[PDB]
Coordinates of C-alpha atoms and ligand atoms in Angstrom, one line a residue:
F1369 CA 199.5 15.9 133.0
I1370 CA 202.3 18.2 131.8
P1371 CA 205.3 16.6 130.0
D1372 CA 208.9 17.7 131.2
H1373 CA 210.1 18.2 127.6
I1374 CA 208.3 18.7 124.2
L1375 CA 209.6 17.9 120.7
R1376 CA 207.6 19.1 117.6
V1377 CA 208.3 17.2 114.4
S1378 CA 207.4 18.8 111.1
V1379 CA 208.5 18.8 107.4
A1380 CA 210.5 22.0 106.5
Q1381 CA 212.9 23.2 103.8
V1382 CA 216.3 23.4 105.6
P1383 CA 219.9 24.1 104.6
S1384 CA 221.5 20.6 104.0
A1385 CA 225.1 20.4 102.7
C1386 CA 224.7 23.9 101.0
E1387 CA 221.5 22.7 99.3
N1388 CA 217.9 22.9 100.3
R1389 CA 216.3 19.6 101.5
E1390 CA 212.7 19.0 102.5
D1391 CA 213.6 17.4 105.8
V1392 CA 211.7 15.9 108.8
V1393 CA 213.0 18.3 111.5
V1394 CA 212.7 18.6 115.2
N1395 CA 211.8 22.1 116.6
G1396 CA 212.5 23.4 113.1
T1397 CA 216.2 22.2 112.7
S1398 CA 218.3 19.2 111.7
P1399 CA 219.8 18.1 114.0
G1400 CA 217.2 18.8 116.6
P1401 CA 217.8 20.4 120.0
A1402 CA 220.0 18.7 122.8
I1403 CA 217.8 17.2 125.6
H1404 CA 219.6 16.9 128.9
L1405 CA 218.4 14.2 131.4
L1406 CA 219.3 13.6 135.0
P1407 CA 220.6 10.2 136.0
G1408 CA 218.3 8.2 138.4
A1409 CA 215.2 10.2 137.2
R1410 CA 211.8 9.8 135.5
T1411 CA 211.4 12.3 132.6
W1412 CA 208.4 12.6 130.3
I1413 CA 209.0 13.7 126.7
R1414 CA 206.0 14.5 124.5
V1415 CA 206.6 14.0 120.8
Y1416 CA 204.1 15.9 118.5
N1417 CA 203.7 14.6 114.9
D1418 CA 203.0 18.0 113.2
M1419 CA 203.4 16.3 109.7
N1420 CA 200.4 16.1 107.4
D1421 CA 200.7 12.6 105.8
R1422 CA 203.7 10.8 107.4
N1423 CA 203.8 8.6 110.6
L1424 CA 206.4 9.2 113.3
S1425 CA 208.0 7.4 116.3
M1426 CA 210.9 8.6 118.5
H1427 CA 213.6 6.1 119.6
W1428 CA 216.0 7.0 122.4
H1429 CA 219.1 5.3 121.0
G1430 CA 221.2 3.5 123.6
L1431 CA 218.8 4.0 126.6
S1432 CA 217.7 0.5 127.6
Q1433 CA 214.2 1.6 128.7
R1434 CA 214.1 -1.5 130.9
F1435 CA 211.3 -0.1 133.1
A1436 CA 209.4 1.5 130.1
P1437 CA 209.5 -0.9 127.2
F1438 CA 206.4 0.8 125.7
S1439 CA 208.6 4.0 125.4
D1440 CA 211.3 2.4 123.1
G1441 CA 209.8 4.2 120.1
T1442 CA 210.0 1.3 117.6
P1443 CA 207.0 0.7 115.3
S1444 CA 205.9 -2.9 114.8
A1445 CA 207.9 -3.7 118.1
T1446 CA 206.8 -1.4 121.0
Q1447 CA 204.0 0.9 119.7
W1448 CA 201.7 1.9 116.8
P1449 CA 203.2 4.8 114.7
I1450 CA 202.2 8.3 115.9
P1451 CA 199.6 9.5 113.4
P1452 CA 199.7 13.0 111.8
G1453 CA 198.4 15.7 114.1
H1454 CA 198.8 13.5 117.3
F1455 CA 201.4 13.0 120.0
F1456 CA 203.0 10.2 122.1
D1457 CA 204.2 10.7 125.8
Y1458 CA 207.6 8.9 126.2
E1459 CA 208.6 7.9 129.8
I1460 CA 212.4 7.9 130.1
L1461 CA 213.7 6.2 133.2
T1462 CA 217.5 6.8 133.6
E1463 CA 219.3 4.5 136.1
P1464 CA 221.8 6.2 138.4
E1465 CA 224.8 5.0 136.2
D1466 CA 223.4 5.9 132.8
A1467 CA 225.4 9.3 132.5
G1468 CA 226.6 9.5 128.9
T1469 CA 226.0 10.4 125.3
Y1470 CA 222.8 9.1 123.4
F1471 CA 220.7 10.5 120.7
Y1472 CA 217.0 10.5 119.7
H1473 CA 215.7 9.9 116.2
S1474 CA 212.7 8.9 114.2
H1475 CA 212.3 5.0 113.8
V1476 CA 210.0 5.4 110.8
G1477 CA 211.3 4.8 107.2
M1478 CA 214.4 7.0 106.5
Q1479 CA 213.2 10.0 108.6
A1480 CA 216.3 9.5 110.9
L1481 CA 218.5 11.0 108.1
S1482 CA 217.2 14.4 109.4
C1483 CA 214.9 13.7 112.4
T1484 CA 217.7 13.2 115.0
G1485 CA 219.2 15.1 117.9
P1486 CA 221.5 14.7 121.0
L1487 CA 220.3 13.1 124.2
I1488 CA 222.7 13.6 127.1
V1489 CA 222.4 12.0 130.6
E1490 CA 224.4 14.4 132.8
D1491 CA 227.1 13.1 135.2
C1492 CA 226.2 15.7 137.9
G1493 CA 229.8 16.3 139.2
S1494 CA 230.4 12.5 139.1
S1495 CA 232.6 12.1 135.9
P1496 CA 235.9 10.4 136.8
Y1497 CA 237.6 13.1 134.5
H1498 CA 238.2 16.9 134.6
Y1499 CA 237.2 19.1 131.6
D1500 CA 236.5 22.8 131.3
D1501 CA 233.5 22.3 128.9
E1502 CA 231.8 20.0 126.3
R1503 CA 231.0 20.0 122.6
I1504 CA 228.6 17.8 120.7
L1505 CA 229.8 16.6 117.3
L1506 CA 226.7 15.0 115.6
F1507 CA 227.3 13.7 112.1
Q1508 CA 224.6 13.1 109.5
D1509 CA 224.4 12.0 105.8
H1510 CA 222.8 14.3 103.1
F1511 CA 220.9 12.6 100.3
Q1512 CA 219.8 14.6 97.2
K1513 CA 216.9 12.1 96.6
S1514 CA 213.8 12.4 98.8
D1515 CA 212.9 9.8 101.5
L1516 CA 209.9 8.7 99.4
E1517 CA 212.1 8.2 96.2
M1518 CA 214.7 6.2 98.2
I1519 CA 212.0 4.0 99.8
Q1520 CA 210.3 3.3 96.4
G1521 CA 213.6 2.3 94.8
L1522 CA 214.7 0.1 97.8
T1523 CA 211.2 -1.7 97.8
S1524 CA 210.8 -2.1 94.0
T1525 CA 210.9 -5.4 92.1
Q1526 CA 213.4 -3.4 89.9
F1527 CA 215.7 -2.5 92.8
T1528 CA 217.2 1.1 92.8
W1529 CA 219.9 1.7 95.4
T1530 CA 219.8 5.1 97.2
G1531 CA 223.3 5.9 95.7
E1532 CA 226.2 6.9 97.9
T1533 CA 226.2 9.8 100.5
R1534 CA 225.9 13.3 98.9
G1535 CA 227.5 14.9 102.0
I1536 CA 228.5 14.7 105.6
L1537 CA 227.0 17.3 108.0
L1538 CA 228.5 18.2 111.4
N1539 CA 225.9 19.9 113.6
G1540 CA 223.8 20.8 110.6
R1541 CA 226.6 22.1 108.3
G1542 CA 228.6 20.6 105.5
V1543 CA 229.1 20.5 101.7
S1544 CA 227.6 18.3 98.9
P1545 CA 230.1 17.1 96.2
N1546 CA 228.3 19.6 93.9
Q1547 CA 229.0 22.7 96.1
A1548 CA 232.1 24.3 97.8
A1549 CA 232.4 26.1 101.2
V1550 CA 233.5 29.7 101.1
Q1551 CA 235.0 31.8 104.0
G1552 CA 232.5 32.6 106.7
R1553 CA 232.1 35.9 108.7
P1554 CA 233.9 35.9 112.2
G1555 CA 231.7 35.3 115.3
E1556 CA 229.2 32.7 116.4
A1557 CA 228.6 29.8 114.1
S1558 CA 227.0 27.2 116.5
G1559 CA 230.7 26.3 117.5
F1560 CA 229.5 25.9 121.1
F1561 CA 226.8 23.1 120.5
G1562 CA 226.5 21.3 123.9
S1563 CA 228.4 24.0 125.9
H1564 CA 227.6 24.7 129.6
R1565 CA 229.0 28.3 129.2
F1566 CA 225.5 29.6 129.9
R1567 CA 220.1 26.4 126.1
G1568 CA 221.0 28.9 123.3
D1569 CA 223.9 26.4 122.9
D1570 CA 221.3 23.4 123.0
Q1571 CA 220.1 24.0 119.4
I1572 CA 222.1 24.7 116.3
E1573 CA 221.5 27.9 114.1
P1574 CA 221.0 26.7 110.5
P1575 CA 223.8 28.2 108.2
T1576 CA 222.7 31.0 105.9
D1577 CA 225.7 30.4 103.5
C1578 CA 227.9 27.5 102.3
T1579 CA 230.4 27.5 105.2
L1580 CA 232.2 24.8 107.1
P1581 CA 231.0 23.4 110.4
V1582 CA 232.9 24.9 113.3
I1583 CA 234.0 23.7 116.8
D1584 CA 235.0 26.8 118.9
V1585 CA 237.5 26.3 121.6
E1586 CA 239.8 28.4 123.8
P1587 CA 243.6 27.8 124.0
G1588 CA 245.0 25.5 126.8
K1589 CA 241.7 23.8 127.9
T1590 CA 240.2 20.3 128.0
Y1591 CA 236.9 19.6 126.1
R1592 CA 234.7 16.5 126.5
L1593 CA 233.9 15.9 122.8
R1594 CA 230.7 13.9 122.4
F1595 CA 230.9 12.2 119.0
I1596 CA 227.4 11.0 117.7
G1597 CA 227.2 8.8 114.6
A1598 CA 223.7 10.0 113.4
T1599 CA 224.6 9.0 109.7
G1600 CA 222.0 6.9 107.9
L1601 CA 224.6 5.2 105.6
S1602 CA 228.2 6.4 106.4
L1603 CA 231.0 4.9 108.4
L1604 CA 233.4 7.9 109.0
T1605 CA 237.1 8.1 109.9
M1606 CA 238.2 11.6 111.1
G1607 CA 241.1 13.5 112.6
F1608 CA 242.2 17.0 113.6
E1609 CA 245.0 18.8 111.8
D1610 CA 248.1 18.9 114.2
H1611 CA 246.0 17.5 117.2
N1612 CA 247.1 13.9 117.8
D1613 CA 246.1 13.3 121.4
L1614 CA 242.4 12.3 121.7
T1615 CA 241.6 10.2 124.8
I1616 CA 238.4 8.1 124.5
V1617 CA 236.8 7.8 128.0
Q1618 CA 233.3 6.5 127.3
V1619 CA 231.8 4.3 124.5
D1620 CA 228.1 4.0 123.6
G1621 CA 226.8 6.1 126.5
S1622 CA 227.1 4.3 129.9
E1623 CA 230.4 2.5 129.8
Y1624 CA 233.5 4.3 131.3
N1625 CA 236.6 2.6 129.7
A1626 CA 240.2 2.8 130.9
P1627 CA 241.4 5.8 128.9
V1628 CA 242.6 5.0 125.3
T1629 CA 244.7 7.6 123.4
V1630 CA 244.2 7.7 119.6
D1631 CA 245.1 10.0 116.6
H1632 CA 241.7 9.6 114.8
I1633 CA 238.1 8.5 115.5
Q1634 CA 236.1 6.0 113.5
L1635 CA 232.3 6.5 113.8
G1636 CA 229.6 4.3 112.4
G1637 CA 225.8 4.7 112.4
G1638 CA 224.5 4.6 116.1
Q1639 CA 228.0 4.7 117.8
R1640 CA 229.0 7.4 120.3
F1641 CA 232.5 8.1 121.8
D1642 CA 233.3 10.6 124.5
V1643 CA 236.8 12.0 123.8
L1644 CA 238.9 14.4 125.9
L1645 CA 240.8 16.9 123.7
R1646 CA 243.5 19.1 125.2
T1647 CA 243.7 22.2 123.0
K1648 CA 246.9 24.0 122.1
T1649 CA 248.2 26.7 124.5
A1650 CA 248.5 30.4 123.4
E1651 CA 252.3 29.7 123.2
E1652 CA 251.9 26.6 120.9
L1653 CA 249.6 28.7 118.6
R1654 CA 252.2 31.6 118.6
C1655 CA 254.8 28.9 117.4
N1656 CA 252.5 27.8 114.5
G1657 CA 252.6 31.4 113.3
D1658 CA 249.5 32.7 115.3
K1659 CA 247.4 30.0 113.5
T1660 CA 243.8 30.1 115.1
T1661 CA 242.1 27.5 112.7
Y1662 CA 242.8 23.7 112.2
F1663 CA 240.9 21.4 109.9
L1664 CA 238.8 18.4 111.1
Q1665 CA 239.0 16.1 108.1
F1666 CA 236.3 13.4 107.9
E1667 CA 236.1 10.7 105.2
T1668 CA 233.6 7.8 104.4
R1669 CA 235.1 4.2 104.5
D1670 CA 234.1 0.9 102.9
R1671 CA 231.8 2.3 100.2
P1672 CA 232.4 2.6 96.4
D1673 CA 232.7 6.4 95.9
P1674 CA 235.0 8.0 98.5
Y1675 CA 233.9 11.3 100.1
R1676 CA 236.0 13.8 102.1
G1677 CA 234.8 16.8 104.0
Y1678 CA 236.0 19.4 106.6
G1679 CA 235.1 21.2 109.7
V1680 CA 237.2 23.8 111.6
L1681 CA 238.6 23.7 115.1
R1682 CA 238.7 27.5 115.8
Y1683 CA 240.6 29.0 118.7
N1684 CA 239.4 32.7 118.2
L1685 CA 235.9 33.9 117.3
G1686 CA 237.7 36.9 115.6
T1687 CA 239.0 34.6 112.8
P1688 CA 236.8 34.1 109.7
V1689 CA 235.8 30.5 109.1
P1690 CA 238.1 29.3 106.3
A1691 CA 237.1 27.4 103.1
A1692 CA 238.3 23.8 102.7
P1693 CA 242.0 23.4 102.0
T1694 CA 243.0 22.8 98.3
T1695 CA 244.9 19.6 99.3
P1696 CA 244.2 17.3 102.3
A1697 CA 245.1 18.5 105.8
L1698 CA 246.1 15.0 106.9
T1699 CA 246.1 11.2 106.0
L1700 CA 243.5 8.9 107.6
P1701 CA 244.2 5.1 107.4
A1702 CA 242.6 3.2 104.4
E1703 CA 241.8 0.3 106.9
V1704 CA 239.0 0.4 109.5
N1705 CA 238.4 -3.2 110.6
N1706 CA 241.2 -3.4 113.2
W1707 CA 240.6 -0.1 115.1
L1708 CA 240.4 -0.6 118.9
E1709 CA 239.3 -4.3 118.7
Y1710 CA 240.0 -6.4 121.9
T1711 CA 241.0 -3.0 123.3
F1712 CA 238.4 -1.2 125.4
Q1713 CA 238.2 -2.5 129.0
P1714 CA 236.1 -1.2 131.9
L1715 CA 237.6 1.6 134.0
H1716 CA 236.2 -0.3 137.1
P1717 CA 236.4 -3.9 136.0
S1718 CA 234.6 -5.1 139.3
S1719 CA 231.2 -3.6 138.2
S1720 CA 231.2 -4.6 134.4
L1721 CA 231.8 -8.4 134.3
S1722 CA 231.2 -9.9 130.8
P1723 CA 229.6 -13.4 130.7
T1724 CA 232.5 -16.0 130.4
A1725 CA 232.6 -18.7 127.6
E1726 CA 231.6 -21.3 130.4
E1727 CA 228.5 -19.2 131.3
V1728 CA 227.1 -19.1 127.7
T1729 CA 224.1 -21.6 127.4
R1730 CA 223.0 -20.8 123.9
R1731 CA 224.4 -19.2 120.7
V1732 CA 222.3 -17.5 118.0
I1733 CA 224.1 -16.9 114.6
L1734 CA 222.6 -14.1 112.4
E1735 CA 224.0 -14.8 109.0
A1736 CA 223.7 -11.5 107.0
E1737 CA 222.7 -12.5 103.4
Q1738 CA 221.7 -10.2 100.5
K1739 CA 219.3 -11.9 97.9
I1740 CA 216.1 -11.5 96.0
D1741 CA 213.1 -12.5 98.2
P1742 CA 211.3 -15.1 96.0
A1743 CA 207.8 -14.3 97.3
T1744 CA 207.9 -10.5 96.5
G1745 CA 210.8 -10.1 94.0
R1746 CA 212.3 -7.4 96.3
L1747 CA 216.1 -7.2 97.0
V1748 CA 216.3 -8.0 100.7
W1749 CA 218.9 -8.3 103.6
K1750 CA 218.2 -11.6 105.5
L1751 CA 219.3 -12.5 109.0
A1752 CA 219.4 -16.2 110.0
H1753 CA 217.3 -17.0 106.7
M1754 CA 214.5 -14.5 107.7
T1755 CA 213.6 -10.8 106.9
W1756 CA 211.8 -8.2 109.1
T1757 CA 210.2 -4.9 108.0
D1758 CA 208.0 -2.4 110.1
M1759 CA 205.1 -4.0 108.0
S1760 CA 206.0 -7.7 108.9
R1761 CA 202.9 -7.3 111.2
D1762 CA 199.9 -5.0 111.7
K1763 CA 199.6 -5.2 115.6
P1764 CA 202.8 -4.2 117.3
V1765 CA 204.3 -7.1 119.3
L1766 CA 204.4 -5.4 122.7
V1767 CA 200.7 -4.2 122.2
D1768 CA 199.7 -7.8 121.4
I1769 CA 201.6 -9.0 124.6
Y1770 CA 199.9 -6.4 126.9
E1771 CA 196.5 -7.4 125.3
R1772 CA 196.7 -11.2 125.2
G1773 CA 199.8 -12.2 127.3
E1774 CA 201.1 -15.8 126.7
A1775 CA 199.2 -16.4 123.3
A1776 CA 201.1 -13.4 121.7
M1777 CA 204.6 -14.8 122.8
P1778 CA 207.0 -16.6 120.4
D1779 CA 207.4 -20.4 120.7
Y1780 CA 210.8 -21.0 122.4
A1781 CA 211.1 -24.7 121.6
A1782 CA 210.2 -24.1 117.9
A1783 CA 212.8 -21.2 117.7
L1784 CA 215.7 -23.4 119.1
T1785 CA 215.2 -25.8 116.1
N1786 CA 214.9 -22.9 113.6
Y1787 CA 218.1 -20.7 113.9
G1788 CA 216.7 -19.0 117.1
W1789 CA 213.5 -17.6 115.6
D1790 CA 209.9 -19.0 115.8
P1791 CA 208.7 -20.2 112.4
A1792 CA 205.1 -19.0 113.2
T1793 CA 205.9 -15.4 114.4
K1794 CA 209.5 -14.7 113.1
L1795 CA 210.5 -13.4 116.6
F1796 CA 213.6 -14.5 118.5
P1797 CA 212.7 -15.5 122.0
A1798 CA 215.1 -15.5 125.0
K1799 CA 214.4 -16.6 128.6
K1800 CA 214.9 -13.9 131.4
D1801 CA 218.5 -14.3 132.6
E1802 CA 219.4 -16.7 129.6
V1803 CA 223.2 -16.2 128.9
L1804 CA 223.4 -15.8 125.1
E1805 CA 226.2 -15.3 122.6
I1806 CA 224.9 -13.5 119.5
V1807 CA 227.1 -13.7 116.4
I1808 CA 226.6 -11.6 113.2
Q1809 CA 228.1 -13.6 110.4
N1810 CA 228.8 -11.6 107.2
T1811 CA 228.6 -13.5 103.8
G1812 CA 229.0 -12.9 100.1
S1813 CA 225.8 -11.5 98.4
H1814 CA 223.6 -13.8 96.3
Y1815 CA 222.3 -10.8 94.3
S1816 CA 223.3 -11.0 90.6
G1817 CA 224.5 -7.3 90.2
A1818 CA 226.5 -7.6 93.5
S1819 CA 227.5 -11.3 93.4
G1820 CA 230.0 -12.3 96.2
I1821 CA 230.2 -8.7 97.5
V1822 CA 230.6 -8.1 101.3
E1823 CA 229.6 -4.8 103.0
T1824 CA 230.3 -3.3 106.4
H1825 CA 227.2 -3.0 108.7
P1826 CA 226.8 -1.1 111.9
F1827 CA 224.9 -3.6 114.2
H1828 CA 222.7 -2.1 117.0
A1829 CA 220.7 -3.8 119.9
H1830 CA 217.8 -2.0 121.4
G1831 CA 217.4 -2.5 125.2
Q1832 CA 220.2 -3.9 127.4
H1833 CA 223.7 -3.3 126.2
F1834 CA 225.8 -6.4 125.3
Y1835 CA 229.5 -7.2 125.8
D1836 CA 231.6 -7.0 122.5
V1837 CA 233.7 -10.2 122.6
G1838 CA 235.4 -9.7 119.2
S1839 CA 235.5 -9.7 115.5
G1840 CA 237.6 -11.1 112.6
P1841 CA 237.7 -12.4 109.0
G1842 CA 236.1 -15.5 107.6
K1843 CA 233.7 -17.8 109.7
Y1844 CA 233.3 -17.3 113.5
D1845 CA 235.2 -20.0 115.3
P1846 CA 234.1 -20.0 119.0
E1847 CA 236.9 -22.4 120.2
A1848 CA 239.6 -20.1 118.6
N1849 CA 237.9 -16.8 119.9
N1850 CA 237.6 -18.2 123.5
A1851 CA 241.3 -19.1 123.3
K1852 CA 242.1 -15.6 122.0
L1853 CA 240.1 -13.8 124.8
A1854 CA 241.8 -16.1 127.5
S1855 CA 245.3 -15.5 126.1
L1856 CA 244.7 -11.7 126.2
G1857 CA 243.0 -11.7 129.6
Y1858 CA 240.6 -9.4 127.8
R1859 CA 237.8 -7.7 129.9
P1860 CA 235.1 -6.7 127.4
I1861 CA 233.0 -3.5 127.7
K1862 CA 229.3 -3.0 127.2
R1863 CA 228.2 -1.5 123.9
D1864 CA 225.0 -1.1 121.9
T1865 CA 226.6 -0.6 118.4
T1866 CA 229.5 -2.5 116.8
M1867 CA 230.6 -2.7 113.2
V1868 CA 230.5 -6.0 111.2
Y1869 CA 233.3 -5.4 108.8
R1870 CA 234.3 -6.5 105.4
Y1871 CA 237.8 -7.9 105.1
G1872 CA 240.4 -7.9 102.3
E1873 CA 238.9 -7.3 98.8
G1874 CA 235.3 -7.7 100.3
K1875 CA 234.4 -10.3 97.6
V1876 CA 234.0 -14.1 98.2
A1877 CA 231.8 -16.9 96.8
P1878 CA 228.0 -16.1 97.1
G1879 CA 227.0 -17.3 100.7
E1880 CA 230.7 -17.8 101.9
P1881 CA 231.3 -16.5 105.4
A1882 CA 233.4 -13.3 105.2
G1883 CA 233.7 -11.6 108.6
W1884 CA 232.0 -11.8 112.0
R1885 CA 231.1 -9.9 115.2
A1886 CA 230.4 -11.7 118.6
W1887 CA 228.3 -10.4 121.5
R1888 CA 227.5 -11.8 124.9
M1889 CA 224.7 -10.8 127.1
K1890 CA 222.8 -12.2 130.1
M1891 CA 219.2 -11.2 129.0
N1892 CA 218.0 -9.3 132.1
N1893 CA 215.4 -6.9 130.6
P1894 CA 212.0 -8.4 129.7
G1895 CA 210.4 -6.8 126.6
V1896 CA 210.5 -6.5 122.9
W1897 CA 213.9 -5.3 121.5
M1898 CA 215.0 -4.8 117.9
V1899 CA 218.5 -5.9 116.8
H1900 CA 219.3 -4.5 113.3
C1901 CA 221.8 -3.0 110.9
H1902 CA 221.7 0.8 111.6
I1903 CA 222.0 1.7 107.8
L1904 CA 218.4 3.0 107.1
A1905 CA 218.3 1.6 103.6
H1906 CA 219.2 -2.0 104.9
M1907 CA 216.4 -1.6 107.6
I1908 CA 214.0 -0.8 104.7
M1909 CA 215.3 -3.9 102.9
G1910 CA 214.6 -6.0 106.0
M1911 CA 217.9 -6.2 108.0
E1912 CA 216.1 -6.3 111.4
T1913 CA 215.2 -8.9 114.0
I1914 CA 212.8 -8.6 117.0
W1915 CA 213.9 -10.3 120.3
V1916 CA 211.2 -11.1 123.0
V1917 CA 213.0 -11.5 126.3
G1918 CA 211.1 -13.3 129.2
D1919 CA 207.7 -14.9 129.5
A1920 CA 204.4 -12.8 129.2
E1921 CA 204.3 -12.6 133.1
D1922 CA 207.8 -10.8 132.9
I1923 CA 206.4 -8.2 130.4
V1924 CA 202.8 -7.5 131.4
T1925 CA 203.8 -6.9 135.1
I1926 CA 205.8 -3.8 133.9
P1927 CA 203.2 -1.1 134.5
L1928 CA 201.9 0.6 131.3
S1929 CA 202.0 4.3 132.3
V1930 CA 200.3 5.5 129.2
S1931 CA 196.5 6.0 128.2
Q1932 CA 194.4 3.3 126.4
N1933 CA 195.1 4.9 123.0
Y1934 CA 198.4 3.0 123.2
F1935 CA 196.4 -0.2 122.2
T1936 CA 195.0 1.2 118.8
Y1937 CA 196.3 3.3 115.8
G1938 CA 194.8 6.8 115.4
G1939 CA 194.8 8.8 118.7
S1940 CA 197.3 10.6 121.0
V1941 CA 199.0 8.5 123.8
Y1942 CA 199.3 10.5 127.0
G1943 CA 201.2 9.8 130.2
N1944 CA 200.0 9.0 133.8
Ligands
LIG3307 C1 200.7 5.0 109.5 O1 200.7 3.7 110.1 C2 199.5 3.0 110.1 C3 199.6 1.8 111.1 O2 200.6 0.9 110.6 C4 199.3 2.6 108.6 O3 198.0 2.0 108.4 C5 198.0 0.6 108.2 O4 198.3 0.7 106.8 C6 198.5 -0.6 106.2 C7 199.0 -0.4 104.8 O5 198.0 0.5 104.1 C8 197.1 -1.4 106.3 O6 197.2 -2.8 105.8 C9 196.5 -1.4 107.6 O7 195.1 -1.5 107.3 C10 196.6 -0.1 108.5 N1 196.5 -0.3 109.9 C11 195.7 0.5 110.7 C12 195.7 0.1 112.1 O8 195.0 1.4 110.2 C13 199.3 3.8 107.7 O9 199.5 3.4 106.4 C14 200.5 4.7 108.0 N2 200.4 6.0 107.3 C15 201.4 6.4 106.5 C16 201.3 7.8 106.1 O10 202.4 5.7 106.3
LIG3308 C1 210.4 22.7 121.0 O1 209.4 23.7 120.6 C2 208.2 23.7 121.4 C3 207.2 24.7 120.9 O2 207.1 24.5 119.4 C4 208.5 24.1 122.8 O3 207.3 24.1 123.6 C5 209.6 23.1 123.3 O4 209.9 23.5 124.6 C6 210.8 23.0 122.4 N1 211.7 21.9 122.9 C7 213.0 22.0 123.0 C8 213.8 21.0 123.7 O5 213.5 23.1 122.8
LIG3309 CU1 219.4 4.5 116.6
LIG3310 CU1 218.4 1.9 119.4
LIG3311 CU1 223.6 -3.2 106.8
LIG3312 CU1 216.5 0.7 116.0

């Protein structure tokens, strides 16, 4: 057995926002190298844990893994953690229509801050759009505190928050608020990340100085820009100086949307947008005084301490990379919660039909509640009056199901009378082909120290993508939303990550409903699928749910193509 691709994960001192950070890196860099997959293929990726005293898993964000649930890479859900000095063979099955932008990252603790890289399913000459080339734009947060310090604070009976982001990286380069970019030498600066111009372009070069991230383009071309929200905390809003025509053509990987023209991108943790950019002609550059550099300006939204950073859209490798401008290049809207809502529709509406209101047979509301956990004294994020951590159980759910079958499954009847989760197992069961509406209901915090506060959360589903059927302030009202969808003739798109926003001042009475997001999905993919806030600190604090779709007969008949070490913690898991 030889795997098709290999990723080696280690701890290394790397450049992070013009500082040094002891990061969990892939193949020596943060972000890690781009992996390119074919649609309609089986591809094996061996992940080595070369760390001394930390566990690892690798999650393939946005890939449903419908035929390889044991390859989802989710500790407590689909596998034992990969131990130090061992590996795990991941079977990636791409369906023919999976062409799109995804990303891989650790699903252990806060490793995903740094242990993250692009995962591209190639069109193979099948994109319904022309473009001369592509660029990957992968965004990360920089924290000055270590992963261990942040986890200890989050899990302490004297709660210490991580603090706000200390920098935004684009393809491994950016600037902490304590540092300042200076002019970079002309020539290559990883400005071609994701380019097909030639593999060299599949892995960033770490910066050697404090210099701005660069996207290198030629005049008068069209680029497919693959925006990847690999931030562990930040919701970003961003735009390009004097470039106002961005066309979004794909959302969260698979889904071709009818083209939407925007002047800025908003990008939360776990989201991807494929955007066509038409670059200025040599004549238009001549008329801006032979200007060859334009600022990309990116800002955090919806958090207490604003942050602004820059990258450079560069038209000529002969131009030195400029420092950040003394005053802002452009103005990004203060508001985020009404950007392209009830907007994206399928390009081919025929082959992407959202479940109708009539077809929904059950609704599960996940009320997001911050409060002290009485049993532990920890500050936690509850969903539907429960909490879930990657230490909620010893034996991972899917391992238990493959070992015992029916006896490991959650109790459906008990879950229906307890907010959708089984009192005995804290799992959310769904029948195969059950048509669900899932609502995330935001609320004012019960925590003294944040009383009545509402936060914005990027909500992500593992496995099958859902249809986004809307959002709004206050309490979800299904009768009103159904009336809204019908009045608009709205044709929803499939997504795997949507924001649950704060509205207005973001402060209500403790426990008062204060913003919602609604999903619909016909649950077609048996297995064990996490649904969670994609902010790493909120996951540490328990903002996760585990969904078990189907009966044991629907899961155990999916062939387990890995060795017997899958069943126990301590050994390498190899493919077959
Ligand atoms: C790696 O993960 C394993 C498996 O979850 C961890 O070991 C478990 O550790 C908990 C907490 O100490 C114990 O209650 C269990 O006895 C352990 N389970 C098994 C199967 O051994 C281990 O702590 C993790 N290692 C690191 C570095 O976090
Ligand atoms: C990562 O590095 C290993 C050797 O350390 C190599 O064998 C593997 O091919 C590299 N993977 C990628 C995608 O570059
Ligand atoms: Cu993810
Ligand atoms: Cu995911
Ligand atoms: Cu959250
Ligand atoms: Cu996840």
